[PDB]
Write a protein that binds this ligand. Structure first.
Ligand SMILES: O=C(Cc1nnn[nH]1)NCCc1ccccc1
Ligand SMILES: [Zn+2]
Length: 258
């Protein structure tokens, strides 16, 4: 009886094994655009992915992780609200059964078809496992997906998914360039929060981009053909792998833009 997104093991259940699920800085949240204040002290975000080395794509039974070589400072996130250097370790998505839902964060209660999380760890903690025990351990770059035109830079991810259908399957995924997943603008909202899956650790500076990327119906349909289950178990389609918005509590969302 492990955690997941079903009726019996979904986000409403998680607090029994992970009491921090009801903590003071949980993610995701609704971003109220009329309450988020412009902060002129916020520096521009620095996304340096030119030397990023992708290695592998993994179905972990909850999502798929594209994993990077984080053994040196190649692909890093700096600037914006961050102190120091955060190393890219993996990206994954959250998505829905239909285009009207799937994002974790919401904008004035609007749900997007999906949400990309680029996960980075603070190098002053030496390793990812140490970093998740610190309030400033992780920086997650959040990007909304809407359905329209295809994203060229996503198609290499879409075409490998046939080969990692079921939990525990992985495939070689070298030379993927995550710069292909960004929008034009790096305008963002920022707030302190958590991982959005167990163990729901309160270690994340959230950086959520204002501009969504467009992906095609055909691109998101191929995300929805993945399986939560392992090989030769009953098919459960990998859909609605999103946690809903959590109480903001004593937190301010800052905007990088006027
Ligand atoms: O990838 C995600 C999903 C997610 N969290 N926040 N947004 N998405 N979480 C990390 C899961 C994890 C944390 C610590 C140790 C082992 C594994
Ligand atoms: Zn995520």
């Amino acid at each position: 009886h492990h955690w997941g997104y079903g009726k019996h093991n979904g986000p409403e259940h998680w607090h029994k094994d992970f009491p921090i699920a009801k903590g003071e800085r949980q993610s995701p949240v609704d971003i109220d655009t009329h309450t988020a204040k412009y902060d002129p002290s916020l520096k521009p975000l620095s996304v340096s992915y030119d030397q990023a080395t992708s290695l592998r794509i993994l179905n972990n039974g909850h999502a798929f992780n594209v994993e990077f070589d984080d053994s040196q400072d190649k692909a890093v996130l700096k600037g914006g609200p961050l102190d120091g250097t955060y190393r890219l370790i993996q990206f994954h998505f959250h998505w829905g059964s239909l285009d009207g839902q799937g994002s974790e964060h919401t904008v004035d209660k609007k749900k997007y078809a999906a949400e990309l999380h680029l996960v980075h760890w603070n190098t002053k903690y030496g390793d990812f496992g140490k970093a998740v025990q610190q309030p400033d351990g992780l920086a997650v770059l959040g990007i909304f997906l809407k359905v329209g035109s295809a994203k060229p830079g996503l198609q290499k991810v879409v075409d490998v998914l046939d080969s990692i259908k079921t939990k525990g399957k992985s495939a070689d995924f070298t030379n993927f360039d995550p710069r292909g997943l960004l929008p034009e603008s790096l305008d963002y909202w920022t707030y302190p929060g958590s991982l959005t899956t167990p163990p729901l650790l309160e270690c994340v500076t959230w950086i959520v981009l204002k501009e969504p990327i467009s992906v095609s119906s055909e691109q998101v349909l191929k995300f929805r053909k993945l399986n939560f289950n392992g090989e030769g178990e009953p098919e459960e389609l990998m859909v609605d792998n999103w946690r809903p918005a959590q109480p903001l509590k004593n937190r301010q969302i800052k905007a990088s833009f006027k």
